[PDB]
């Protein structure tokens, strides 16, 4: 796996199992499954008031306030229809599937239920895609607190959409390797003839973050994507949203696989040094031939 995926496996598995149990005609059993995801997201699939016939899937996010703004539920409503209900106490979004009113083709609703977090993110993000498509300059620009110490500053103009990631890693080894993994991020635009303008900075914050509360500091890195109307059109904005959504998690993932990569080269060099040491052991004059197990040969 190189690119992180956007659909959660536990949601899909649990809902598909419940829908298979309901479609076969078996009586429904209880369900109470709580789990998490990337960026501190918390999922909870349960039943409302012990009602074993309804399954409610709730999600608690970190961009709590940006999703409550007016117009931040157009995509969620459009995709989820009647499944979207009032949030469960303590959570932020909540779907409600009735196991007796499930439409046919139960694969589509489960495929769209595993992408609940991606859809909550794309709903608060397509606002600026539309602010740019409709040909209006100076539309609202905000800061999505998609994590707790990192921010994503989104701005929409007449001809572009600027996304500035203010990012910082927790561990010291991760910080030291992330400096490299972020310095070398402008060398990617040589792999495709059409890639958004990427700018990296850790000396000083960009001039977009001087009127806003996006996280700044001397340990934070700033990565600016400039998505043009060839990356934010009504046909290639799904991939763009997926990538802008999973960028930080993908960088973290590959920072943590770089170590398991380096370990193999270190083992190789360790063996190469052992081979240089081996020149010190005087070769024996006669060895006793043994067996696969290691016992005496028992024969000539």
């Amino acid at each position: 796996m190189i690119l992180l995926e956007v659909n959660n496996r536990i949601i899909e598995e649990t809902l598909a199992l419940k829908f298979e149990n309901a479609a076969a005609g078996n009586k429904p059993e209880a369900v109470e499954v709580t789990f998490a995801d990337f960026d501190g997201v918390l999922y909870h699939i349960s039943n409302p008031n012990g009602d074993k016939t309804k399954v409610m899937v709730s999600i608690s996010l970190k961009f709590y306030k940006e999703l409550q703004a007016h117009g931040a539920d157009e995509l969620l409503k459009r995709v989820y229809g009647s499944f979207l209900v009032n949030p469960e106490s303590g959570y932020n979004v909540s779907l409600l599937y009735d196991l007796e009113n499930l439409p046919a083709s139960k694969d589509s609703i489960v495929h769209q239920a595993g992408m609940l977090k991606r859809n909550c993110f794309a709903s608060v993000f397509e606002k600026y895609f539309q602010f740019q498509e409709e040909g209006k300059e100076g539309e609202n620009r905000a800061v999505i607190h998609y994590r707790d110490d990192e921010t994503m500053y989104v701005e929409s103009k007449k001809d572009r959409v600027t996304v500035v990631f203010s990012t910082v890693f927790k561990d010291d080894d991760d910080v030291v390797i992330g400096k490299v993994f972020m310095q070398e991020f402008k060398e990617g635009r040589r792999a495709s003839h059409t890639a958004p303008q990427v700018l990296f900075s850790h000396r000083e914050p960009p001039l977009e973050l001087k009127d806003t509360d996006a996280a700044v500091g001397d340990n934070i890195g700033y990565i600016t994507f400039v998505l043009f109307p060839r990356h934010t059109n009504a046909s290639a904005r799904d991939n763009t949203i997926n990538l802008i959504h999973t960028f930080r998690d993908y960088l973290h993932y590959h920072i943590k696989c770089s170590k398991a990569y380096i370990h193999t080269r270190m083992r190789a060099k360790t063996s190469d040094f052992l081979k240089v040491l081996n020149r010190a052991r005087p070769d024996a004059e006669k060895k006793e031939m043994k067996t696969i197990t290691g016992k005496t040969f028992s024969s000539r």
Binding site: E288, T293, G294, K295, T296
Partner: protein, 394 residues
């Protein structure tokens, strides 16, 4: 041999090894493991040229263990199997060993202290009814050790294959309320080494593999001196790894185990024994004696038994005793510690001290008739003849 031509044999009958000979001798005439084996077939071993009788005993039953199922007739000093013990004794007094006519011989036997009395009673019964010996005596092991060393005072720490016991004696008067008996010895150390080796991927699960692990513990293992320093050596360096070639041909590697298996004498909690080590038990035994005998008990600590032959056991015992004395007598005064005088007498031939003491005692008392339990006294009284020794049984 006495003035009647009746040979005076001395037989130690240890849990892990029989040491037999004659009175006045300077070395045991025969030292052989006390195990009885029966022939079995195994799918991994193939032998077709050495004649294996239906019952091998002692030395041949240990050297030919690859084709036998062996079992010890003794355990913890208590005879668990009486038929196997009778076979071992038949072999001991047989032609391919001490060759004696048991009808016209006296014998000197031993027994650990604080042992069930039915054991000694049945041993005497067997010696008088089966072999029909003309005289039997059952001496105390610490008394024999002090006979062999040539002392009259000292605290014998006798740690055999089957059992460890600490017995102090002062001026020839036995203090039986201070006799301590800890049940950790060579065999439990061997089992702990088997466990540790199983942690490394080697499996010694058969009756014969126990002797292999025993011969490993005897060659490689040693008692640590400063256990923190030994653990630092085992965890930081690689100078403790040593290879051993099993009989079949496999090569095993033993590392830190070398000082972890025999440590279960000083730290019993490693093998799930709730008590104190041999050093702390020795110190408590001493500090339980009257004030006027402690200072002489500290100067005559006599080691005995095979299990005290680990490289560096005397020095570690002395260091442990000095630390205990500094913390619990001088209460932390380092200045006075230099005045504390221990002397852990570890003679070079300390593996057969009990037999040498038995030889001395028998050479002294062979020609008396109030020392031995005579067969006539047995035929007249029964198991009451043991009252001659000072052990009152009815």
């Amino acid at each position: 041999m006495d003035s009647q031509g009746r040979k005076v044999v001395v037989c130690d009958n240890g849990t892990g090894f029989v040491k037999c000979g004659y009175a006045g001798s300077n070395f045991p005439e025969h030292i052989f493991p006390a195990l009885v084996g029966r022939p079995i077939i195994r799918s991994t071993t193939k032998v077709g040229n050495i004649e294996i009788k239906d019952l091998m005993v002692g030395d041949e039953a240990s050297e030919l263990r690859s084709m036998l199922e062996v079992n010890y007739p003794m355990e913890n000093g208590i005879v668990r199997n009486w038929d196997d013990m009778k076979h071992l004794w038949d072999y001991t007094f047989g032609p391919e060993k001490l060759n004696i006519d048991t009808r016209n011989c006296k014998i000197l036997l031993t027994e650990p202290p604080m042992n069930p009395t039915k054991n000694r009673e049945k041993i005497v019964e067997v010696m008088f009814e089966t072999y029909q010996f003309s005289g039997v005596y059952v001496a105390i092991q610490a008394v024999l050790t002090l006979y062999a060393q040539g002392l009259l005072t000292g605290v014998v720490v006798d740690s055999g294959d089957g059992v460890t016991h600490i017995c102090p004696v002062y001026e020839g008067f036995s203090l039986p309320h201070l006799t301590r008996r800890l049940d950790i010895a060579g065999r439990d150390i061997t089992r702990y080494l088997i466990k540790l080796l199983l942690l490394r991927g080697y499996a010694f699960n058969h009756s014969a593999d126990f002797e292999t692990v025993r011969m490993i513990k005897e060659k490689l293992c040693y008692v640590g001196y400063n256990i923190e320093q030994e653990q630092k050596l085992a965890l930081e360096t690689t100078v403790l790894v040593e290879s051993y070639t099993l009989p079949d041909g496999r090569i095993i590697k033993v590392g830190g185990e070398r000082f972890e298996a025999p440590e279960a004498l000083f730290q019993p909690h490693l093998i799930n024994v709730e008590g104190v080590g041999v050093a702390e038990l020795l110190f408590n035994t001493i500090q339980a004696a009257d004030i006027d005998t402690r200072s002489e008990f500290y100067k005559h600590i006599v080691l005995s038994g095979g299990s005290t032959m680990y490289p560096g056991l005397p020095s570690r015992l002395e260091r442990e005793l000095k630390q205990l004395y500094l913390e619990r007598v001088l209460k932390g005064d380092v200045e006075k510690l230099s005045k504390f005088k221990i002397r852990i007498e570890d003679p070079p031939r300390r593996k057969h001290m009990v037999f040498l003491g038995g030889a001395v005692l028998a050479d002294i008392m062979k020609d008396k008739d109030n020392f031995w339990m005579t067969r006539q006294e047995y035929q007249e009284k029964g198991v009451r003849v043991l009252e001659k020794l000072g052990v009152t049984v009815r």
